[PDB]
Design an enzyme around this catalytic site. Structure first.
Site, PDB file in Angstrom:
ATOM      1  N   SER A   1     -53.655 -13.125 -43.712  1.00 52.02           N
ATOM      2  CA  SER A   1     -52.860 -14.169 -44.332  1.00 52.02           C
ATOM      3  C   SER A   1     -52.283 -13.659 -45.647  1.00 52.02           C
ATOM      4  CB  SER A   1     -53.731 -15.407 -44.564  1.00 52.02           C
ATOM      5  OG  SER A   1     -53.063 -16.400 -45.316  1.00 52.02           O
TER       6      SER A   1
ATOM      7  N   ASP B   1     -63.414 -20.000 -26.812  1.00 52.51           N
ATOM      8  CA  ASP B   1     -63.852 -19.370 -28.056  1.00 52.51           C
ATOM      9  C   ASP B   1     -63.110 -18.057 -28.256  1.00 52.51           C
ATOM     10  OD1 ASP B   1     -65.152 -18.419 -30.252  1.00 52.51           O
ATOM     11  OD2 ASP B   1     -67.058 -18.030 -29.227  1.00 52.51           O
TER      12      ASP B   1
END
Length: 330
Positions: free
Chosen positions: A199, A35
């Site tokens: 992004s 994770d």
């Protein structure tokens, strides 16, 4: 040193991935959910409340000649999905894919919430976010990667998750045969303890690319792709009959649909998520309404590049003095 381990989807939807981890002496192998959105290595154990164990493999520290109680240490964690767990702490030898750390904090669960009990395939979590998020008190502990870093050939790990198939976590090296083209690296902020990056935009299907900054986290422990409501609406508007369902808890679409791809930007590069990766199947057994793999982050407080996005790429988690993320197509 290096390590390399195969990671395997837990079910036919890729709801999560499990990776075998050796703990203790003699080894006890548990299948952990790696994770990159958390920083605790915790396991079902011989200390877990018996009624909260249902099929998981447990770690028994009393059977490990290298286990030592970390005296006074406790831990307690809550995840974005509302699940939680807590317990006490041992140090022990932990190996992943041939890479060994001695003295790793292994957080033994005394209590786990229902969603953990109900998932017999996940024996615990192995956190790979920054150690500043580790919950052990009163002495915070380091992640497996942080402990291994100095010994690694290169201070990196990579995630290569499969679509409906196994993939690989590598530690200490970048497998240049595992991706196509080049790896595009992008800046990381560690201020929230995550692999947080920006992004450069998105496209839906064959549509034109929209240049827009989208801050979010690379999180292997989250199944879906959670993005701003504007972006998500633009995606689902291209699917006839798709709608946001308050009763189901997100966007659903007709199971008869063929989904468009979704592209996200990494610098000037582009990662394409095929439409099929966005199908999470019937909302309930036998339903013709299917659950979408791109959902709004509006109720979260952060955008999350979960498995739906990451499995479309070869992803480098670069733990150099200034961390960065790399993405390549594959």
């Amino acid at each position: 040193s290096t390590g390399s381990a195969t990671t395997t989807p837990i079910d036919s939807l890729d709801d999560a991935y499990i990776t075998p981890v050796q703990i203790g002496t003699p080894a006890q192998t548990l299948n952990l959910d790696f994770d990159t959105g958390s920083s605790d290595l915790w396991v079902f154990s011989s200390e877990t409340t018996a009624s909260e164990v249902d099929g998981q493999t447990i770690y028994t520290p009393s059977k490990s000649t290298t286990a030592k109680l970390l005296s006074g240490a406790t831990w307690s964690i809550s995840y974005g999905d509302g699940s939680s767990s807590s317990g006490d702490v041992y140090t022990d030898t932990v190996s992943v894919g041939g890479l060994t750390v001695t003295g790793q904090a292994v957080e033994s669960a005394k209590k786990v919430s229902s969603s953990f009990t109900e998932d017999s395939t996940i024996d615990g979590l192995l956190g790979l976010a920054f150690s500043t998020l580790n919950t052990v008190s009163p002495t915070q502990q380091k992640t497996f990667f942080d402990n291994a870093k100095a010994s690694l050939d290169s201070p990196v790990f990579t995630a290569d998750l499969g679509y409906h198939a196994p993939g690989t976590y590598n530690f200490g090296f970048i497998d240049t045969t595992a991706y196509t083209g080049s790896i595009t690296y992008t800046a990381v902020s560690t201020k929230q303890g995550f692999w947080e990056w920006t992004s450069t935009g998105y496209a839906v299907g064959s549509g034109t690319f929209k240049s827009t900054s989208i801050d979010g986290i690379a999180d292997t422990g989250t199944t879906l792709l959670y993005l701003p409501a504007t972006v998500v609406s633009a995606y689902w508007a291209q699917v006839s009959g798709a709608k946001s369902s308050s009763s189901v808890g997100g966007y659903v679409f007709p199971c008869s649909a063929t989904l468009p791809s979704f592209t996200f930007g990494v610098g000037s590069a582009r990662i394409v998520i095929p439409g099929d990766y966005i199908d999470f199947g019937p909302i309930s057994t036998g339903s013709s309404s299917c659950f979408g793999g791109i959902q709004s982050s509006a109720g979260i407080g952060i955008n999350i590049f979960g498995d739906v996005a990451l499995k479309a790429a070869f992803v480098v988690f670069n733990g150099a003095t200034t961390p960065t993320l790399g993405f390549a197509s594959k």
